[PDB]
Amino acid sequence: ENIAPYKFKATMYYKDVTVSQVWFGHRYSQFMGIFEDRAPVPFEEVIDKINAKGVCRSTAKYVRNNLETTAFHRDDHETDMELKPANAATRTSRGWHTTDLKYNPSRVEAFHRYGTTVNCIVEEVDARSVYPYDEFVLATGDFVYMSPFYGYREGSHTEHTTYAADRFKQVDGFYARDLAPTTRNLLTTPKFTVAWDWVPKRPSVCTMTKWQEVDEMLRSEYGGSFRFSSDAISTTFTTNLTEYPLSRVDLGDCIGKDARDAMDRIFARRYNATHIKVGQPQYYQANGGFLIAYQPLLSNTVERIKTTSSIEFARLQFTYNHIQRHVNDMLGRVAIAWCELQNHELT
Amino acid sequence: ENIAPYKFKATMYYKDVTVSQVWFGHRYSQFMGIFEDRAPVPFEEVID
Amino acid sequence: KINAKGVCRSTAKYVRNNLETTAFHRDDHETDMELKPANAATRTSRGW
Amino acid sequence: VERIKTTSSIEFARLQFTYNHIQRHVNDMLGRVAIAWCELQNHELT
Amino acid sequence: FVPLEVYTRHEIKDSGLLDYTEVQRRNQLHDLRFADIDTVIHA
Amino acid sequence: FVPLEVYTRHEIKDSGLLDYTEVQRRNQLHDLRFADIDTVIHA
């Protein structure tokens, strides 16, 4: 069972409206309050000046908490700062910020002076979503209440969003900035904007993970249940005789392609000139929730599955079955030879 | 060993005192600060 | 004053967010309060 | 200079020990059985 | 041999009192659920 | 017997959408990365 969340790059654009309030006193100056806010940048800004010219305005026009507000950085008129990369850090993805300090009013004695600050920050993170891929998270701890695959083309509108259509715009033929045409995907959450290269859901996600590639997996039907014994990985699975229809596995598209590639690679590497495939690859569902893609050989002569967290049941099954085959075979030979000895000694 | 925590319903009552400070400017209006506070409701309020 | 006399000033002189600011507690002139232990709590390390 | 990475399951090694213990025992005992069986056959030849 | 777990990874995850996902997922719904993030007022 | 895990502890840790370490480690770099914490301005 795939418990690895969906992972993909994502670009977070926001202006840190961090307004400060300062008092200048008779002998020294102290704050009265500092408000910080994360302000979204409109779609048109990301397209026209983040993607095209790598600049960003000194104003952050956004509707904050049911009111439209813009913040003139420097407390001066609007100006578009050339974006620049942030200072270095250890294993953090690339970030970029226009402003590098915070504006503060010059001292005027015994007066209350308010100080604004806008740092139009562009930062790239990696996003993470989990089934049902209803909404996804970004590294900064924030959220985006919408499926990673929501959009317009190819039934993307089916996938869940939790925003009015105005907040969610999409670019076709998007040219990624040098900071190949793409299909970029932007949402203006009440704090920021997230852009990730939109991709079709079913091919780009899966609820099953390729766990192992057994080069030799003996199969033996027994007691109305298949036994899948792998001497290489020391494991013996058990499944029902009926195959497992892939249509029942939710978002199981990856299984067919990954399986096919794995059996083809293994066949080329080891069984190209010794065996021949018999029938198209089969799929069985094992105890402990292990979908098995099985490709029988011969010598030239809708739901979600749940997987256990302990192979040790299956490894015990394999060890016990191996030892039992051996001891049963050997004690059977002993008993047969003992009968033959008795009948032979009768003379 | 029970490591499953104790679970039970619970009803949370509060008033989000979210006070905002706004400036109206010569040509446009911008905040000066927004304070949000979670305020308890007295027992008698919940009851009555 | 923390290591030697266990006192601390009523002013907090520090550069906050690219600006130097100090805060006179009590809104009065500077005074060094004798440190005292905080009230009790359950399996929290000592505070003052 | 490097850093080693440790698995999260001793059960591979505990299976290795259990299987090796049982295998030593059964191989030793079936070897004794086969040896005694040969000796029995050669002995019964008379 | 049936699969056996003293503690499935779900209850092991649930053993924690809180978690980022649930906790501030709810904490950032708070604005969406208990306020409008689209309506604009001018006067 | 080769070591075998259906889920290594790394992917079990990664199964969570977020985590304090990554999340607010980044969230408190935010100031350092996107601002100066040493420059002092007086006027």
Swiss-Prot record, chain D:
Subunit structure comment from the entry: Homotrimer; disulfide-linked. Interacts with host receptor MYH9/NMMHC-IIA. Interacts with host receptor MYH10/NMMHC-IIB. Binds to heparan sulfate proteoglycans. Interacts with gH/gL heterodimer. Interacts with the host coreceptor PILRA.
Listed name of the protein: Envelope glycoprotein B
UniProt record similarity statement: Belongs to the herpesviridae glycoprotein B family.
Compartment annotation: Virion membrane; Host cell membrane; Host endosome membrane; Host Golgi apparatus membrane
Function comment: Envelope glycoprotein that forms spikes at the surface of virion envelope and binds to the host cell entry receptors MYH9/NMMHC-IIA and MYH10/NMMHC-IIB, promoting the virus entry into host cells. Essential for the initial attachment to heparan sulfate moieties of the host cell surface proteoglycans. Involved in fusion of viral and cellular membranes leading to virus entry into the host cell: following initial binding to its host cell entry receptors, membrane fusion is mediated by the fusion machinery composed at least of gB and the heterodimer gH/gL.
Species annotation: Human herpesvirus 1 (strain KOS)
Recorded name of the encoding gene: gB
PTM notes: The cytoplasmic tail is phosphorylated by the viral kinase US3. Phosphorylation may be linked to a down-regulation of gB expression on cell surface.
Top-level division of the source organism's lineage: Viruses
Curated annotation (Swiss-Prot), chains E, F:
Compartments where located: Virion membrane; Host cell membrane; Host endosome membrane; Host Golgi apparatus membrane
Highest taxon in the source lineage: Viruses
Modification note: The cytoplasmic tail is phosphorylated by the viral kinase US3. Phosphorylation may be linked to a down-regulation of gB expression on cell surface. ubiquitinated.
Protein task: Envelope glycoprotein that forms spikes at the surface of virion envelope and binds to the host cell entry receptors MYH9/NMMHC-IIA and MYH10/NMMHC-IIB, promoting the virus entry into host cells. Essential for the initial attachment to heparan sulfate moieties of the host cell surface proteoglycans. Involved in fusion of viral and cellular membranes leading to virus entry into the host cell: following initial binding to its host cell entry receptors, membrane fusion is mediated by the fusion machinery composed at least of gB and the heterodimer gH/gL.
Subunit and partners: Homotrimer; disulfide-linked. Interacts with host receptor MYH9/NMMHC-IIA. Interacts with host receptor MYH10/NMMHC-IIB. Binds to heparan sulfate proteoglycans. Interacts with gH/gL heterodimer. Interacts with the host coreceptor PILRA.
Family: Belongs to the herpesviridae glycoprotein B family.
Name of the featured protein: Envelope glycoprotein B
Organism the protein comes from: Human herpesvirus 1 (strain KOS) (HHV-1)
Coverage span on the entire protein: 683 to 725 of 904
